[PDB]
Amino acid sequence: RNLPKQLTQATQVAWSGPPPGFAKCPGGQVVILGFAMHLNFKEPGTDNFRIISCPPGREKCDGVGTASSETDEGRIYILCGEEPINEIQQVVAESPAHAGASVLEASCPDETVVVGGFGISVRGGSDGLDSFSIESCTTGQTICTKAPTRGSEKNFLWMMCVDKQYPGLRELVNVAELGSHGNANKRAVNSDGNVDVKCPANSSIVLGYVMEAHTNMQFVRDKFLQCPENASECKMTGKGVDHGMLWLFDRHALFGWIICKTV
Ligand SMILES: [Cl-]
Ligand SMILES: [Mg+2]
Ligand SMILES: [Mg+2]
């Protein structure tokens, strides 16, 4: 039909809670696409970072991983509509633990090309967000990659692919952004830095999200929001929370990802 209009019209849902969790579509709707994350930015190692797709045609998306500590959190994002877009196929990939200088690479299934997506690089431990980064996948390619940055130890990505001739695909563009990041600042009441994910000129938002990553994800559940359709940008401030022990500062990173379409 028309991919930008269809994706814009579909309903976005962004859910935070203990993992695995689930996010539900509004009554009468089913998943078109989405992802579920397990994240923990305090515990050591990288096993607590995971992304999976939300399979289409289900009334909800179930998450992944376990609630082993209070710092384990789920973040689930879905786009819901009356029915699936069968031409869409989702792909996730992740690196092994201790990924080193390894670039993560995932390809679309045969005869499909990227609609959009993003990749994240992370490191565990209470200071691991110092190594956080996000990159977008690029519409019209057959591949998406994520390279390590600033001492990261794991890469993961999620993307959506579609049959290469699908109407309107050309009108789409992906933007990911890392906003303010570093030590959290409890002195900044709901103003602890920001992320501002901007559409390129003459485009407006189809869908997307903004999130605050935080050493204690369980204290920033409200800082995970869908991005407003047809706006020129998507903005979020940091909560300003810091539960670091004694002199330690919790870390945070404000980030997001959008797809925009031509107006
Ligand atoms: Cl510190
Ligand atoms: Mg693009
Ligand atoms: Mg930037």
Numbering used by the authors: 810 to 1072
What's in the article?
Toxoplasma and Plasmodium are the parasitic agents of toxoplasmosis and malaria, respectively, and use perforin-like proteins (PLPs) to invade host organisms and complete their life cycles. We report structures of the membrane attack complex/perforin (MACPF) and Apicomplexan PLP C-terminal β-pleated sheet (APCβ) domains of TgPLP1. The MACPF domain forms hexameric assemblies, with ring and helix geometries, and the APCβ domain has a novel β-prism fold joined to the MACPF domain by a short linker.
An expression construct representing the TgPLP1 APCβ (residues 810 to 1072) was crystallized in space group C2 with the crystals diffracting to 1.1 Å resolution. Comparison of the repeats with one another indicates a root mean square deviation (RMSD) of 1.28 to 1.56 Å over their roughly 80 residues each arranged into six β-strands with four forming one face of a sandwich and two the other. The two sides of the 4 + 2 sandwich forming each repeat are linked together by two highly conserved disulfide bonds, which can be treated as a signature motif of this domain. Among the other notable features of the TgPLP1 APCβ is the presence of a long projecting loop at its base, which is tipped by a tryptophan and has additional sequence features that make it resemble the similar loops found at the base of the CTDs of perforin itself and the CDCs.
